[PDB]
Design a protein around this ligand. Structure first.
Ligand SMILES: CCCCCCCCCCCCCCCCCC(=O)OC[C@H](COP(=O)([O-])OCC(O)COP(=O)([O-])OC[C@@H](COC(=O)CCCCCCCCCCCCCCCCC)OC(=O)CCCCCCCCCCCCCCCCC)OC(=O)CCCCCCCCCCCCCCCCC
Ligand code: BCL
Ligand code: BCL
Ligand code: BCL
Ligand SMILES: CC[C@H]1c2cc3[nH]c4c(c3C)C(=O)[C@H](C(=O)OC)c4c3nc(cc4[nH]c(cc(n2)[C@@H]1C)c(C(C)=O)c4C)[C@@H](C)[C@@H]3CCC(=O)OC/C=C(\C)CCC[C@H](C)CCC[C@H](C)CCCC(C)C
Ligand SMILES: CC[C@H]1c2cc3[nH]c4c(c3C)C(=O)[C@H](C(=O)OC)c4c3nc(cc4[nH]c(cc(n2)[C@@H]1C)c(C(C)=O)c4C)[C@@H](C)[C@@H]3CCC(=O)OC/C=C(\C)CCC[C@H](C)CCC[C@H](C)CCCC(C)C
Ligand SMILES: COC1=C(OC)C(=O)C(C/C=C(\C)CC/C=C(\C)CC/C=C(\C)CC/C=C(\C)CC/C=C(\C)CC/C=C(\C)CC/C=C(\C)CC/C=C(\C)CC/C=C(\C)CCC=C(C)C)=C(C)C1=O
Ligand SMILES: COC(C)(C)C/C=C/C(C)=C/C=C/C(C)=C/C=C/C(C)=C/C=C\C=C(C)\C=C\C=C(/C)CC/C=C(\C)CCC=C(C)C
Ligand SMILES: CCCCCCCCCCCC[N+](C)(C)[O-]
Ligand SMILES: CCCCCCCCCCCC[N+](C)(C)[O-]
Ligand SMILES: CCCCCCCCCCCC[N+](C)(C)[O-]
Ligand SMILES: CCCCCCCCCCCC[N+](C)(C)[O-]
Ligand SMILES: CCCCCCCCCCCC[N+](C)(C)[O-]
Ligand SMILES: [Cl-]
Ligand SMILES: [Fe+3]
Lengths: 300, 281, 238
């Protein structure tokens, strides 16, 4: 028995969770229990917390999504057969280079891109504020909000900061499945191949390392789950044979090891350094370095 | 030297091969038969790479590159200078990686833990063997394998990708990328959550797993739980590498045209293939 | 140029982060020791970090790490060689003595509490109203060991109330006393629970709990340690 799926599910009263300083008026009631989800993790859906920031983020997020969608329907001549056929090929493109950083471009030629982007900007930042405030209400550290800020950095650079420093919105990413892949491919060709961007190479190392580390960590915790390994907080406060065997597996394999707390510090940093080094690599492309091959030839 | 708690675990037994002969440590490192096998395979492999550096006429690690045999050799042996060293180094690398896995199994048995770690590592080995053994053999030459050099292997990624147009359009590649991105998101959240509970606001008591469940229900209406997130991380990261191997085993074998053109199966379905408007007509 | 300044800066940052991360991972098990328990001469290049203090919930005090490290138990092992790096042979019964894969740690002899300060793990009989919601209900099944002999019957499931999962089967032996088996070391089948780790004759030796309706962190460690040690030590009878 490997502990990938539960052999038996148990259920008790719905868990309405901890209170601390949380405003209970803004919590929903429990949703249904999913037996399916229960083979792998928890069966309980809900409750969710929805205050003013939650509604703002959710309405804004839907307006971003519907704004792209209405443009896709227009492009499909309002035909549901075409909509489905061409779904991956539709693209809401930013305004042309002509209009620079101006908000004066017509709807059909990049005005609708700026409207959708505005909605996305409100959606993400209000959601950022929500990850901070939900942690505050429970008296927990702000680790989740600081980690999320690293994802926000790369997004902010691609769609906002880099377009502003280059002096036009045309440099930003289009809203479309195949179109954003072409943009990604195009970006590398125009900047003399991103494999020569040392920040892109570090980003890859961390993306890689995140899969290496979660394979290692996930496998390790399942291998010591027969001594209550997954109870990581109590193993931090009072080391058990689970934390000792986990450390010693790795010490005996590769000559050094982690603590039950310390492996989570390795984990949060391996992950945040993906988008951290990535955003720097993109910020410097076209602003400071026109061509990474050329730069690499001067090492400088 | 030993961790303060280590001595009670350093007992005899758990070896797969050789009984008590290799059942010892060197500093922190466990040996075992597969420790000896790893050193032999690794050492012979390093020597061969040095002897390759000689024949190439460079000691710069940014220029050393060991190339597979040229395509005209097919699946035969080649002279050392022209792909034979690559062939032997590849047998040594496979030898070192499998030996490393079986050594992890011996350490599992001595410690009375599950075999999940060497199981997970075997997925990395399978990706490696896909690029250097399985794909080349199905395509009919060692020459389709990647070379062993820091920058020349990136050159191979670029040339192999662009052979099929923009390699983004490989659908198994799309799924693999989705798992890689999701795994990193999941690793950030898992690290952040545990640390936020163990290290709360200054002067407050350590939080409980109940706080961790509550945080995530408040935020997104669902908590997978402490066992679930470790299952999730193992699954996302093994899936990323599974789909990686799959995306390359099908490239140059069952599909060898531009990947972008594959998506015409969807567009040319008879019930909408000829309807005017949209992007495709 | 700016890109050069950024990459150089990044490598210095990363070297500092690795220093910080390695010192954080030395808050347990350090300093290093010789096989005789004396402090090793060579500690490596990284120093012990400044202590931090965790405030434990429910009035259970504090933990300061790094802090003084002892096993707080006798270790029934002897050297097999005259130099460092060889195995240490059990001097008695490694299952009874709690060495090798049967090792346990002297955790607090208190049960883990949930966020409300109630016992985390309860027998299902005392947990209102927990029930088997999916999968085969093991309660009433006979328990078979690796010698293919019946060792007892399941009489309850001990559940984690806050995480709603099964953690132990409570098993009744020939003599009417019960033992806990960890859920992760049993296979539930249609007509039996099968235990690879232990033969039937080793079930009576599973350490007992001192209250019938709670289990302490120390007791969990003795039970899980003992059951895992069977993989190596019950192997003459598998
Ligand atoms: C783009 C934005 C990306 C931001 C990513 C931040 C990652 C967050 C990780 C983290 O620990 O967050 C929790 C951490 C503290 O959370 P908390 O809930 O306030 O504290 C709870 C506990 O009291 C305390 O809980 P704790 O003990 O977990 O927190 C302590 C934490 C405190 O962490 C920090 O103070 C953050 C360190 C700075 C991060 C900025 C990195 C910038 C990279 C520059 C690259 C150069 C390119 C050119 O300690 C560290 O992690 C030390 C970092 C070591 C850095 C090594 C410096 C090398 C110098 C070279 C010589 O967050 C922050 O400190 C805020 C960071 C905001 C940055 C803007
Ligand atoms: C995976 C798909 C492609 C591939 C595409 C890319 C792309 C794209 C990039 C790399 C990059 C790297 N690749 Mg590669 N790479 C491939 C297969 C390999 C194999 C192999 C299968 O044996 C190895 C050992 C490497 C190793 C490397 C590193 C030199 C570098 C960073 C890896 C990393 O951080 O991972 C995560 C692992 C860790 C963080 C653990 C640490 C691993 C260390 C750093 C590996 C050192 C290897 C050493 C130099 C090899 C010689 C050692 C011998 C004993 C003599 N690649 C295949 C062919 N690779 C990046 C780079 O910067 O290249 C210059 C980069 O941008
Ligand atoms: C031809 C293509 C080019 C190339 C061009 C680019 C370009 C351009 C970029 C990269 C970037 C990256 N490349 Mg590259 N790259 C190439 C080849 C490779 C190869 C390889 C050959 O094996 C690999 C492994 C990579 C890997 C990578 C990653 C390390 C990195 C993206 C990190 C990330 O997680 O972003 C994913 C994460 C984000 C984008 C953050 C998003 C956060 C926001 C806030 C989320 C909003 C969600 C929204 C509200 C929707 C809601 C959804 C619902 C709620 C579900 N590239 C080649 C050479 N690559 C990126 C980078 O950083 O470069 C340095 C980038 O910009
Ligand atoms: C221009 C280039 C093309 C492209 C062409 C290709 C080609 C060609 C390939 C990929 C492959 C991949 N691409 Mg691509 N790819 C592109 C753009 C991207 C982008 C992006 C954001 O644009 C991303 C995120 C990716 C992501 C990916 C991954 C799905 C995959 C690589 C991971 C992997 O296979 O690990 C697998 C891990 C390994 C192979 C490592 C195994 C490690 C071994 C077992 C152990 C090594 C031990 C070591 C020697 C020890 C060191 C010593 C110690 C340090 C002491 N590509 C562009 C469009 N891509 C590769 C793939 O799928 O391969 C299967 C592949 O071949
Ligand atoms: C360390 C970098 C990695 C990362 C981290 C990260 N992402 C995060 C977080 C963190 C730490 C959060 O806390 C936050 C979150 O709430 O996650 C559950 C989030 C988040 N990352 C998300 C997505 C996401 N992250 C991505 C990437 C990454 N995030 C990196 C790999 C990507 C990619 C690969 O492109 C995506 C698509 C969301 C699930 C969430 C932010 C939610 C948000 O802003 O929503 C706004 C919009 C709506 C609420 C409505 C959407 C419209 C309808 C479809 C509904
Ligand atoms: C399957 C999910 C992820 C994963 C998992 C994973 N990897 C693992 C493990 C696991 C579970 C281990 O237990 C094991 C380990 O010990 O980790 C510390 C390991 C490991 N993964 C490693 C690397 C690694 N993993 C990678 C990827 C991944 N590993 C996946 C993303 C990558 C990438 C993405 O490129 C790398 C580089 C090592 C740190 C370690 C295995 C070490 C090992 O096998 O040691 C024995 C061999 C030697 C000491 C070296 C021998 C040298 C050769 C004889 C000659 C050189 C040949 C080589 C082809 C040269 C090519 C170099 C050029 C390409 C530059
Ligand atoms: C909660 O639990 C957990 C722990 O602990 C409580 C842990 O520690 C870990 C382990 C994780 C960490 C310590 C975090 C840091 C790890 C990484 C960032 C992953 C990347 C690691 C490396 C790059 C190190 C690789 C080193 C290797 C392979 C050693 C090679 C060097 C040698 C000299 C060995 C030579 C070869 C042989 C044959 C062995 C020796 C034999 C003879 C001398 C003969 C995890 C996952 C965990 O979840
Ligand atoms: C079926 O019909 C319904 C009704 C359901 C509608 C259907 C909708 C559909 C099918 C939608 C599909 C949407 C898709 C496929 C979206 C894809 C998006 C992708 C791939 C996004 C990729 C990258 C995006 C980036 C990098 C965006 C960055 C944005 C910013 C950083 C914000 C920038 C803000 C700007 C420029 C404005 C700022 C203005 C002020 C005043 C501050
Ligand atoms: C990733 C979240 C959803 C995963 C759901 C997968 C369900 C697996 C069902 C397992 C079957 C039950 N069994 C026989 C193992 O006890
Ligand atoms: C990640 C997806 C999970 C979403 C689950 C959210 C559950 C919402 C609960 C709905 C119940 C509402 N109400 C008012 C009847 O209590
Ligand atoms: C949490 C830190 C882990 C350290 C991982 C470091 C990997 C080294 C990557 C080398 C690539 C360097 N390059 C060529 C992009 O400049
Ligand atoms: C470029 C990445 C390679 C880094 C490899 C470093 C492995 C660390 C080994 C630690 C063992 C130290 N020792 C022998 C004192 O125990
Ligand atoms: C890829 C980055 C990971 C490697 C970082 C190097 C850590 C080595 C620490 C050695 C610890 C040795 N000692 C004596 C303290 O146990
Ligand atoms: Cl899989
Ligand atoms: Fe964990």
């Amino acid at each position: 028995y490997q502990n990938i799926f539960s052999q038996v599910q148990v259920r008790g009263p719905a868990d309405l969770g901890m209170t601390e300083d949380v405003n209970l008026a803004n919590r929903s009631g429990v949703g249904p229990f999913s037996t399916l989800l229960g083979w792998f993790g928890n069966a309980q859906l809900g409750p969710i917390y929805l205050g003013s920031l939650g509604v703002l983020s959710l309405f804004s997020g839907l307006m971003w999504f519907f704004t792209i969608g209405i443009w896709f329907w227009y492009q499909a001549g309002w035909n549901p057969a075409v909509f489905l056929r061409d779904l991956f090929f539709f693209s809401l493109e930013p305004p042309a280079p002509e209009y620079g950083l101006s908000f004066a471009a017509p709807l059909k030629e990049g005005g609708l891109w700026l409207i959708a982007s505005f909605f996305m900007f409100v959606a993400v930042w209000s959601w950022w504020g929500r990850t901070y405030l939900r942690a505050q209400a429970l008296g927990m550290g702000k680790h989740t909000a600081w980690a999320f800020l690293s994802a926000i950095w790369l997004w902010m650079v691609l769609g906002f900061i880099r377009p502003i420093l280059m002096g036009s919105w045309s440099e930003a990413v289009p809203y479309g499945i195949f179109s954003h892949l072409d943009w990604t491919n195009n970006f590398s060709l125009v900047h003399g191949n991103l494999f020569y961007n040392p920040f892109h190479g570090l980003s890859i190392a961390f993306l890689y390392g995140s899969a290496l580390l979660f394979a290692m960590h996930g496998a390790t915790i399942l291998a010591v789950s027969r001594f209550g390994g997954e109870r990581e907080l109590e193993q931090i406060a009072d080391r058990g044979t689970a934390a000792e065997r986990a450390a010693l597996f790795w010490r005996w394999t590769m000559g050094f090891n982690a603590t039950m707390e310390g492996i989570h510090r390795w984990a949060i940093w391996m992950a945040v350094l993906v988008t951290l080094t990535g955003g720097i690599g993109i910020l410097l492309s076209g602003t400071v370095v026109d061509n990474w091959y050329v730069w690499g030839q001067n090492h400088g | 030297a030993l961790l303060s708690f280590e001595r009670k675990y350093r007992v005899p037994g758990g070896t797969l091969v050789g009984g008590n002969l290799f059942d010892f440590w060197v500093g922190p490192f466990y040996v075992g038969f597969f420790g000896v096998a790893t050193f032999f395979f690794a050492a012979l492999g390093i020597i061969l790479i040095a002897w390759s550096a000689v024949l190439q006429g460079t000691w710069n690690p940014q220029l050393i590159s060991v190339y597979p045999p040229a395509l005209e050799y097919g699946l035969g042996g080649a002279p050392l200078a022209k792909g034979g060293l690559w062939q032997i180094i590849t047998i040594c690398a496979t030898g070192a990686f499998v030996s490393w896995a079986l050594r992890e199994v011996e350490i599992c048995r001595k410690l009375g833990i599950g075999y999940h770690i060497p199981f997970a590592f075997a997925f990395a080995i399978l990706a490696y063997l896909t690029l250097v053994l399985f794909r080349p053999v199905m395509m009919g030459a060692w020459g389709y394998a990647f070379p062993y050099g820091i920058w020349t292997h990136l050159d191979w990624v670029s040339n192999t990708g662009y052979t099929y147009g923009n390699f983004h359009y490989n659908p198994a590649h799309m799924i693999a990328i989705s798992f890689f991105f999701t795994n990193a998101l999941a690793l950030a959240l898992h690290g952040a959550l545990v640390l936020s509970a163990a290290n709360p606001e200054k002067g407050k008591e350590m939080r409980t797993p109940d706080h961790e469940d509550t945080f995530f229900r408040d935020l997104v209406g669902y908590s997978i739980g402490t066992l679930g997130i470790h299952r999730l991380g193992l699954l996302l990261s093994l899936s990323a590498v599974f789909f990686s191997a799959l995306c390359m085993i099908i490239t140059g074998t069952i599909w060898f045209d531009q990947w972008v053109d594959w998506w015409q199966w969807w567009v040319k379905l008879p019930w909408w293939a000829n309807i005017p408007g949209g992007i495709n007509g | 140029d700016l890109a050069s300044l950024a990459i150089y800066s990044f490598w210095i940052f990363l070297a500092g982060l690795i220093y910080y991360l390695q010192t954080e991972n030395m808050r347990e098990g350090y300093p290093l020791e010789n096989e005789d328990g004396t402090p090793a001469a060579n500690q490596g290049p990284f120093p012990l970090p400044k202590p931090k203090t965790f405030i434990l919930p429910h009035g259970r005090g504090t933990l300061t790490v790094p802090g003084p490290e002892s096993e707080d138990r006798p270790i029934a092992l002897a050297r097999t060689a005259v130099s460092e790096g060889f195995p240490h042979a059990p001097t008695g019964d490694p299952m009874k003595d709690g060495v090798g894969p049967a090792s346990w740690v002297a955790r607090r002899d208190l049960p883990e509490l949930d966020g409300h300060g109630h016992n985390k793990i309860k027998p299902m009989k005392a947990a209102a109203g927990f029930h088997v919601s999916a999968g085969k209900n093991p309660i009433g099944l006979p328990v078979r060991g690796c010698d293919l002999e019946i060792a007892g019957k399941v009489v309850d499931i001990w559940v984690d109330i806050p995480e709603q999962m099964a953690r132990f089967l409570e098993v009744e032996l020939k003599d009417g006393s019960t033992r806990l088996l960890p859920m992760q070391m049993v296979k539930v089948q249609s007509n039996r629970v099968h235990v690879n780790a232990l033969s039937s004759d080793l079930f009576a030796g599973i350490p007992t709990i001192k209250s019938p309706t709670e289990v302490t962190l120390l007791e969990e460690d003795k039970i899980c340690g003992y059951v895992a040690g069977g993989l190596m030590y019950a192997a003459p009878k598998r």
